[PDB]
From a paper:
The eukaryotic translation initiation factor 4E (eIF4E) protein is a vital component of the cap-dependent mechanism for mRNA translation. It binds the 7-methylguanosine (m7G) cap structure present at the 5′ end of mRNA molecules and recruits it as part of the eIF4F assembly which also includes two other partner proteins, eIF4A and eIF4G, to the translational machinery for protein synthesis. We have used a structure-guided approach to rationally develop a set of hydrocarbon stapled-peptides with high binding affinities and residence times against the oncogenic eukaryotic translation initiation factor 4E (eIF4E) protein. Crystal structures of these peptides in complex with eIF4E show that they form specific interactions with a region on the protein-binding interface of eIF4E which is distinct from the other well-established canonical interactions.
Two 15mer peptide derivatives of sTIP-05 (sTIP-09: 1KKRYSR*QLL*FRRR15 and sTIP-10: 1KKRYSREQLL*FQR*15) were synthesized, one with an “13RRR15” sequence extension and the other with an i, i + 4 hydrocarbon staple shifted to positions 11 and 15 of the peptide sequence which encapsulates the “12FQR14” sequence at the C-terminus. In sTIP-10, position 7 was substituted by a glutamic acid (E7) as is seen in the sequence of the parent eIF4G1 peptide. Significantly though, their rates of dissociation decreased relative to sTIP-05 and hence residence times were improved (68 seconds for sTIP-09 and 39 seconds for sTIP-10). The crystal structure of sTIP-10 with eIF4E showed that the helical content of this peptide was relatively higher than in the other peptides because the i, i + 4 hydrocarbon staple stabilized an additional helical turn in the extended C-terminus of the peptide. However, this staple linker was still exposed to the solvent as observed in the other crystal structures, with no interactions made with the protein. The side-chain of Q13 behaved similar to W13 in sTIP-07 and R13 in sTIP-09, forming hydrogen-bond interactions with N77 and hydrophobic interactions with residues W73, Y76 and L131. Residue R14, being exposed to the solvent, did not form any specific interactions with eIF4E but should contribute to peptide solubility. MD simulations of the sTIP-10 and eIF4E crystal structure showed that the peptide maintained the additional helical turn observed at the C-terminus primarily because of the stability provided by the hydrocarbon linker. Residue Q13 in the extended terminal segment contributed favorably (–2.0 kcal mol–1) to binding through its predominantly hydrophobic interactions with eIF4E along with the core residues (Y4, R6, L9, L10 and F12; –2.1 to –6.9 kcal mol–1) in the peptide.
Numbering used by the authors:
A (entry chain A): 31 to 205, 211 to 217
B (entry chain B): 3 to 15, 101
The structure:
Amino acid sequence: PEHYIKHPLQNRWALWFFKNDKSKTWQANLRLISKFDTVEDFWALYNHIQLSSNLMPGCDYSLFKDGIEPMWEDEKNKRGGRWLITLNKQQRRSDLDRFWLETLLCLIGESFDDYSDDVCGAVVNVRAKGDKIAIWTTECENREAVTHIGRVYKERLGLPPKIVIGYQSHADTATTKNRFVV
Amino acid sequence: KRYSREQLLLFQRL
Ligand SMILES: CN1CN([C@@H]2O[C@H](COP(=O)(O)OP(=O)(O)OP(=O)(O)O)[C@@H](O)[C@H]2O)c2nc(N)[nH]c(=O)c21
């Protein structure tokens, strides 16, 4: 219970926003919002922006490590993939916001041990057809890392053993099969 | 530098 020091995070993080505008190219619709590197600065940003459940369909938030843009094209994403949590419309009210926050805490908390280095970031897609949350990792052939991340993330989300989540390569998503499953 | 869920959530409250 400290009195004046802030609590530094392992990494500096950038929050990005995406606004659906079909008259533009996909990457022109990405806006960098803010960056932070302490627990206090995280909460101050979180408390000052809308819950994902209140965004317009077509919008995203992404939290990525500083220097990694939330796009396949980035050098740290092009060889990577994502652990995908899919939700229907009717779970928006009940699950979206608490899953998304849990995902933020796994990122900024460095909850995957050594393998947190493989984490690039996370994305929440709010969509009329069904929302998605995912953790993007740097290298889909780092089997030990990808598998430990997904096992721990499913546990942290608190999902039943009989709901199975999948890991997709971005190369496959661009052109989806799963490389791993948990 | 690592923080558990509970240590992170504590600062939201404090
Ligand atoms: C993450 N994306 C998404 N994207 C474009 O946006 C489209 C939809 O991607 P999404 O927003 O991730 O998913 P969603 O809106 O649910 O559509 P879908 O259900 O087809 O996946 C893709 O088909 C792609 O053309 C991208 N285009 C580029 N160049 N780089 C990227 O990193 C991404």
